[PDB]
């Protein structure tokens, strides 16, 4: 009964292609040569920088490193606003709250741990430890000051009570490592890629996965929304990046070239999204044509491998950690 | 500038030579990381251990400070995560010889990290444990590991080299050196044997850099 | 709870000398800069001193540069200033004040309850029109401050500061960088202005709406207060 199934889903996705997106897009002008130059280099992290989350206000971002500090930068100035030192030094994600009165980070240890910044004393401090995974925390991002995902290594992605402290909902049906989290606009549904090559459209109140995407060779390190919230672009080891659609239910777009043979660590696109922008292995970063599977740019200003990048809600900059702990700004 | 904002590039700049004591205070420690199978000693390798997600241990010998990862209680998928440990010194090995059916997982996961793209060029400090529970089996169970390929003698320090050779077979590449040790859990100084291999690390490093290798 | 505790003080001969405390607690002291503000009997605010954090920078008010040396504890959590050559016009209840300087922070956010000394016997103007509005309950109020000189910084900022003192009470943060309500204050009052022309509105008043109210400038050493206005029921 699954092999019927999962060839009637296989059927019913075929029935739906009457067209391609390249052919719909192909009398629409090339973006062009898009040529962006470091405006901002921030320094003082001492290690490889695993992540990085743009605060809401386009201004504030804050950056988490194998050195054990999260800091908070001012990017228009480079000022360090504050330097938070984490317990443990293995973080590997890091979210910046809506409101700007919480950063949240995690990693091995298994816990997305909070941060208040607003205190009456002039000190940031920790607000929670959410325990609970049974492995690594690979991504964390806030709905609200109360409620924050997390996706893990367990297979698994949890919607935790910040005043509680214990998990709301659990999400459940990957078969592989939960490597990384998308949001959609509105907070209702949220995209998670994983080890297992596939994709799963999770309902946040129901606790239910929608839909499951598929088409990718090795394991998907990166995933985000595009800014409708009708569609998601994922990266993965195997060297490629894709574009999925939630309402046909299937792949649009794949963007690849012969002379990239190296995995993609993070992925994020414009304020239009015309654009989609992602670090690699390779010490740089690619702008893709999003319409047009075409590239349409690069930025190769990093000694090691670019490990996170993020584009400001007013889509004026984009950001970029790597390996080699700097943090470059491009405009 | 507005006079808050030369507070706060004041502020950055006190911030700043925090982060940089931090730096330097952290730039003493040598960084090792633990393997080896389940029950191999790994937890009861030094004395010294002063601390499920990860497990830190720290010694301190001859006013070098040590930093041992146990890595074993993830769990998870190990490709993931192991390029967070790429510029530890050294990989601390431990291996059970009186185990002779978790002989062949020990042997393959040495494998997986001896050939693995971050540690190509990171040192193995091998410890063969349990030579002492090792002497006592082999008179009972000669061949119960290696059954094709070994036919020599069945003494105690004939196999137990033998088991040490199969392990250095998998050392595909230069530049990196294998200190291999047999230890017994009885009674052992085992600080002396990992502080040994790291300044002979060290130097190699330095005699490349400096260009002498 | 934040706690600052002045002590030192209460008659001196001229041309004697004294030592004033400020006894930290409740906050991280060694992340604030702080400041001396003083009252005159029957007068306004006036800014006497700044300490940085970390004592990097140090100001005086032209007043009481070379008589008077401000300094810093950090292990004690102590604030200091010591006064040599007292004069009639150093009469004033001195108060501690701290101040952290970051995007988006609230420097002179809270205030000590101040120590009284008696000494027996180019800079920005901030001009306070009216000195007393009688007020009702629930009526809406609309108090003013000018300056000589544009607060409106190149970086988007203006720097003005409100502060209210009710009867017996030290003055209290409302309003910072001319638009932003501080933390813990009622959502009625309100900052408007434009370069030199400020204004603080309350909606509603209420009993405790009841003091002298307070325009301060920040944009420049030495910081300047204006004859603050009083609000009678």
């Known amino acids: 009964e699954a092999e019927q199934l999962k060839n009637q889903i296989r059927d019913a996705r075929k029935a739906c292609a009457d067209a391609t997106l390249s052919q719909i897009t192909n009398n629409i002008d090339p973006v062009g040569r898009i040529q962006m130059r470091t405006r901002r280099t921030l320094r003082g992290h001492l290690a490889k920088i695993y992540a990085m989350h743009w605060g809401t206000d386009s201004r504030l971002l804050v950056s988490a490193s194998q050195d054990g500090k999260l800091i908070i930068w001012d990017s228009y100035t480079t000022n360090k606003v504050h330097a938070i030192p984490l317990r443990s030094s293995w973080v590997m994600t890091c979210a910046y709250a809506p409101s700007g009165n919480y950063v949240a980070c995690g990693g091995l240890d298994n816990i997305c741990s909070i941060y208040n910044l607003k205190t009456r004393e002039g000190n940031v401090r920790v607000s929670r430890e959410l325990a609970g995974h049974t492995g690594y925390l690979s991504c964390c991002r806030f709905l609200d000051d109360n409620q924050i995902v997390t996706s893990s290594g367990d297979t698994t992605c949890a919607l935790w009570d910040i005043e509680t402290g214990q998990q709301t909902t659990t999400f459940t049906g990957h078969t592989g490592d939960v490597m990384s989290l998308s949001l959609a606009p509105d907070t209702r549904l949220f995209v998670s890629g994983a080890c297992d090559a596939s994709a799963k459209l999770w309902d946040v109140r129901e606790g239910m996965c929608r839909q499951t995407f598929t088409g990718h060779e090795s394991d998907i390190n990166a995933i985000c929304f595009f800014p409708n919230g009708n569609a998601f672009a994922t990266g993965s080891d195997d060297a490629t990046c894709r574009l999925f659609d939630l309402r046909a239910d299937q792949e649009l777009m794949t963007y690849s070239h012969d002379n990239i043979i190296c995995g993609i660590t993070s992925v994020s696109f414009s304020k239009s999204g015309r654009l989609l922008l992602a670090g690699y292995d390779d010490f740089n970063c690619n702008v893709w044509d999003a319409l047009k599977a075409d590239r349409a740019g690069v930025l190769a200003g990093h000694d090691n491998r670019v490990s996170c990048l993020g584009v400001t809600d007013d889509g004026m900059a984009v950001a970029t950690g790597s390996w080699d702990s700097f943090l470059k700004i491009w405009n | 500038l507005s006079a808050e904002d030369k507070a706060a590039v004041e502020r950055s700049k006190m911030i700043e030579k925090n982060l940089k004591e931090d730096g330097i205070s952290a730039a003493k420690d040598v960084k090792l990381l633990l393997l080896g199978a389940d029950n191999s000693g790994k937890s009861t390798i030094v004395k010294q251990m002063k601390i499920t997600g990860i497990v830190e241990t720290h010694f301190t010998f001859k006013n070098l400070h040590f930093r041992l990862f146990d890595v074993g209680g993830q769990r998870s998928e190990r490709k993931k995560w192991i390029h967070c440990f790429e510029d530890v010194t050294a990989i601390i090995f431990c291996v059970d010889l009186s185990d002779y059916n978790r002989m062949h997982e020990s042997l393959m996961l040495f494998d997986s990290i001896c050939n693995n793209k971050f540690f190509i060029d990171t040192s193995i400090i091998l410890f063969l444990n349990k030579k002492d529970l090792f002497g006592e089996k082999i008179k009972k169970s000669p061949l119960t590991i290696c059954f094709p390929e070994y036919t020599g003698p069945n003494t105690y320090e004939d196999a137990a080299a033998y088991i040490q050779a199969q392990f250095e077979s998998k050392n595909r590449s230069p530049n990196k050196e294998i200190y291999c040790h047999m230890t017994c859990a009885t009674d052992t100084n085992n600080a002396q044997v990992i502080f040994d291999a790291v300044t002979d690390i060290i130097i190699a490093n330095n005699l490349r850099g400096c260009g002498l290798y | 709870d934040v706690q600052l505790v002045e002590s030192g003080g209460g008659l001196v001969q001229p041309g004697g000398s004294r030592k004033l405390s400020c006894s930290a607690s409740?906050?991280?002291?060694?992340?604030?800069?702080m400041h001396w503000v003083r009252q005159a009997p029957e007068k306004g605010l006036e800014w006497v001193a700044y300490?940085?954090?970390?004592?990097?920078?140090?100001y005086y008010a032209d007043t009481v540069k070379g008589r008077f040396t401000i300094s810093r504890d950090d292990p004690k959590n102590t604030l200091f200033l010591q006064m040599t050559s007292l004069r009639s016009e150093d009469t004033a209840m001195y108060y501690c004040?701290?101040?952290?300087?970051?995007?988006?922070?609230?420097?002179?956010?809270?205030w000590g309850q101040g120590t009284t000394l008696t000494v027996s016997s180019s800079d920005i103007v901030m001009t306070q029109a009216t000195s007393s509005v009688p007020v009702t309950p629930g009526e809406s109020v609309s108090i003013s401050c000018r300056s000589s000189?544009?607060?409106?910084?190149?970086?988007?900022?203006?720097?003005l500061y409100w502060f209210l003192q009710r009867p017996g009470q030290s003055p209290q943060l409302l309003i910072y960088?001319?638009?932003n309500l501080a933390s813990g204050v009622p959502d009625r009052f309100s900052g408007s202005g434009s370069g030199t022309a400020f204004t603080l509105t309350i909606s509603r008043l209420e009993a405790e709406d009841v003091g002298v109210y307070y325009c301060?400038?920040?944009?420049?050493?030495?910081?300047?207060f204006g004859a603050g206005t009083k609000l009678e029921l």
């Open positions: 004040v701290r101040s952290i300087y970051y995007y988006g922070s609230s420097p002179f956010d809270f």
């Open positions: 409740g906050f991280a002291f060694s992340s604030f800069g």
């Open positions: 300490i940085s954090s970390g004592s990097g920078t140090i």
């Open positions: 000189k544009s607060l409106l910084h190149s970086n988007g900022n203006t720097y």
């Open positions: 960088r001319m638009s």
């Open positions: 301060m400038q920040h944009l420049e050493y030495p910081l300047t």
